[PDB]
């Protein structure tokens, strides 16, 4: 009966939240036991339930964000947190298309006088 993140992947948001609340209640009851003479078994359970809560919240955040990305996929304007991070300078570069652009003057020059492959006899 451990909370493994694989068992939470498909569940629905209201289901997971209910599961979260049980863990939040279970923890607050333990925090009481910490100061009222809880058994060493109950003190060790706190970390087990702190991380279980974090496991549930991770899966809730991941499931929400994976669906938000599906939602804004085709949209021209996406929320900043859904945009590629990289670095600030790497986000201000000319993109792939703009770097590949050439003027018609340069395009003509490469067509007429392409670099050739040759050899010079010994």
């Amino acid at each position: 009966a451990k909370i493994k993140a694989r068992d939470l992947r498909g569940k629905k948001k209201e289901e997971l939240l209910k599961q979260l609340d049980d863990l939040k209640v279970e923890l607050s009851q333990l925090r009481v036991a910490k100061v009222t003479g809880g058994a060493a078994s109950k003190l060790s359970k706190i970390r087990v339930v702190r991380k279980s809560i974090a496991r549930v919240l991770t899966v809730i955040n991941q499931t929400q964000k994976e669906n938000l990305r599906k939602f804004y996929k085709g949209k021209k304007y996406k929320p900043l947190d859904l945009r590629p991070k990289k670095t600030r300078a790497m986000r201000r570069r000319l993109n792939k298309h703009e770097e590949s652009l050439k003027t018609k003057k340069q395009q003509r020059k490469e067509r007429l006088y392409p670099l050739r492959k040759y050899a010079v006899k010994a």
Partner: peptide
């Protein structure tokens, strides 16, 4: 049975926050 066990693509609109939904409505 305890021993037997122990020895071995589209948006989901329910997961979108309620705020985003209203904006498209």
């Amino acid at each position: 049975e305890s021993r037997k066990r122990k020895r071995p693509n589209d948006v989901d609109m329910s997961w979108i926050p309620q705020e985003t939904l209203n904006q498209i409505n």
